[PDB]
Nucleic acid binder design. Structure first.
Ligand SMILES: [Ca+2]
Ligand SMILES: [Ca+2]
Ligand SMILES: [Ca+2]
Ligand SMILES: [Ca+2]
Lengths: 80, 55, 99, 99, 80, 55
DNA sequence: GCTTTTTTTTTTCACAATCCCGGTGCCGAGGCCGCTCAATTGGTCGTAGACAGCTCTAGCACCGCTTAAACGCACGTACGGATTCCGTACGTGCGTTTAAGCGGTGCTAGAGCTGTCTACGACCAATTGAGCGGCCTCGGCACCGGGATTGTGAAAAAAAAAAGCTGCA
DNA sequence: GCTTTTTTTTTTCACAATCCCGGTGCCGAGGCCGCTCAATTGGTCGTAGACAGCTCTAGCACCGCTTAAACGCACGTACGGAATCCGTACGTGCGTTTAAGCGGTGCTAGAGCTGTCTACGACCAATTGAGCGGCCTCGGCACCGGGATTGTGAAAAAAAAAAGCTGCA
């Protein structure tokens, strides 16, 4: 239905485990989906802008890397 | 130097992202220099809040 | 003699496990389709280098893990062990993500 | 009988007053001496433009006012009305100012 | 001299009031002086760095504006 | 435009720093644009948290 | 001092996580090619900037008085935090269902390159008005005093409410 | 049923504080002025990127199999949040103390500008070797298996606190 639901409750539980969380309200799984969608929205918007500016129909890794740098979340290992 | 020592500690002759992540985040100064940087396939430092443990 | 672990014990095992590992924790395909779905809302018929969608995931997972660490402290700060939506909201408020 | 406001009522007045106003709330001289004092650790016999000290003050107070907002949210989050050192500390930990 | 005490209790309370604070622990005041000092050390060190690079013996407002911009704390109105 | 309105509403002819600040922070978009910017002699928006108010 | 419940502690079993074997196998580090183009060498030439030398801004310090602001105490309300208490929201551990992932094939959009051409920007020099620093008016704002309005809080009414008293089919 | 008692609730009623008003007088917004410097106009050369035309990379479609992860659900423990309770930390307001802020004059470090000159980078061309993709091979790391070893809990029976019982001082 929504691809957002493809980010499942068990995947969310794993992420919060890596972030040291022990116990998790039921409500969080939607809340998380909200945040994550807004995160992607913002990063993808700027990446595609770089794509549209490069006159390409293909979003490169570099497009994302420049988008993630602009958003203050610099990313190493993907052609930085 | 530090990531190499992290590889030596895991019985690996090859440095991988994790070894760099462990080098950078256990050293105070490097951690601060790269505070706003994400290291791909780096993971996080093993760290569980004290109140979450049993007695 | 059916064995049972108390509530929290497996959680504590999972934390320990996942902190030790570096492998991406969202299933890659549902993620890829979500990236493609959201990308449509800005431009139609968009192609993605596989590495581009991988960057986006590596990025998405680090940020959320990090946010969970900050959220977890907000819960603990309010004398709780259970994270809740308001914990995430305070965290992002203080980080300067939302107003 | 001698008149008395209840605890909390003047605190709110003081808020309304200072949020309405824009003037600096630290006394200019004790601040200037502090600026000169810290500046000695790095280089001795330093002069300061007057505007540089005002800039430094404008910046300090905007930082601290702002920090008190975040702090006040952290106290509220733990169902308290009183700010404490742990509130400031958590706020700063989330902002990334402190490890 | 020993000027950090010159950041008085009442002046800290005043800032906190502008920050919407109603009730304030007794421990806040020394805690705030620490933060304020840390804040100043960092801003000033970079200011002074700029001053020294310009071969001057007098800190300018630009030195401070430039330092503040370096701390992600941009200031408008002092030649910024 | 917005700083003038804040002046007129203060019964003043000339824009001041406050007027700019009010104008900027009361507009969602400008507040975003200048989220990490400090307007000197601006002060803050009146905003007392509801839980702190009497009953 | 005793009894009568619940704690807290101490002492067996269980289950995962791990080290140490040993062996196996896969591919990507690792390093060797053989150009190649991008860094070294050499040389000439401009101007960016070190330095002197001067002006004259603004930073500093110092006195002296007024008064607001800070300082320290007495007093007391409401706050923070400790306890007890209850309901069910979560974590656990089963079975059941589903589609992620793997490996493979098959197409072709479109990334990404080479070569040709020229419109569009650097460059220069003469021209010369928009924009600067300096300076002088004059009306908006800072400030004051005084009255009008707002808002809090104590203690004294109106009303509601919640128990004790009487009769009561 | 109704009287009595009691907390709420609600209204009066003083008093502090904050808001508007006009009156005053001072100082920087505002605009004018005359000069200077940077923008424009109108030259020429040069190439940087638009464009076509080609290659062939890697991004998409699709299928079929093997589990592994996702999904419900039965069950109960441990958490959250509500409620009550209580000592004292913090707010409020008082007299007393401090020193900031005010204006002023007096002094001169040094910020800043101007003119000189030269060592240092730019620009160019001929040289030439370090770094380039492109390949090809072997050992370092995934993986499985199994069987210690060590760790880390749960549970179950024991070894101490909690409350409750007196009656008793
Ligand atoms: Ca309470
Ligand atoms: Ca002018
Ligand atoms: Ca070209
Ligand atoms: Ca190579």
């Amino acid at each position: 239905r929504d691809n957002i639901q493809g980010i499942t409750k068990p995947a969310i539980r794993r992420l919060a485990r890596r972030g040291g969380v022990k116990r998790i309200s039921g409500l969080i799984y939607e809340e998380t989906r909200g945040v994550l969608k807004v995160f992607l929205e913002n990063v993808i918007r700027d990446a595609v802008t770089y794509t549209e500016h490069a006159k390409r129909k293909t979003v490169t890794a570099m497009d994302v890397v420049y988008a993630l740098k602009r958003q203050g979340r610099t990313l190493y290992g993907f052609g930085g | 130097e530090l990531a190499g020592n992290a590889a030596r500690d895991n019985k690996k002759t090859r440095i991988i992202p994790r070894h760099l992540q462990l080098a950078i985040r256990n050293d105070e100064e490097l951690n601060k220099l790269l505070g706003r940087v994400t290291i791909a396939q780096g993971g996080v430092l093993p760290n569980i809040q004290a109140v979450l443990l049993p007695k | 003699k059916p064995h049972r672990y108390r509530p929290g014990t497996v959680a504590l095992r999972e934390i320990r496990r996942y902190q030790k590992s570096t492998e991406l924790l969202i299933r890659k395909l549902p993620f890829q389709r979500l990236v493609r779905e959201i990308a449509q809302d800005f431009k139609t018929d968009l192609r993605f280098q596989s590495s581009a969608v991988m960057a986006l995931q590596e990025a998405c997972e680090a940020y959320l893990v990090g946010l969970f660490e900050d959220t977890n402290l907000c819960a603990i700060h309010a004398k709780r062990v259970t994270i809740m939506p308001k914990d995430i909201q305070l965290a992002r408020r203080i980080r300067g993500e939302r107003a």
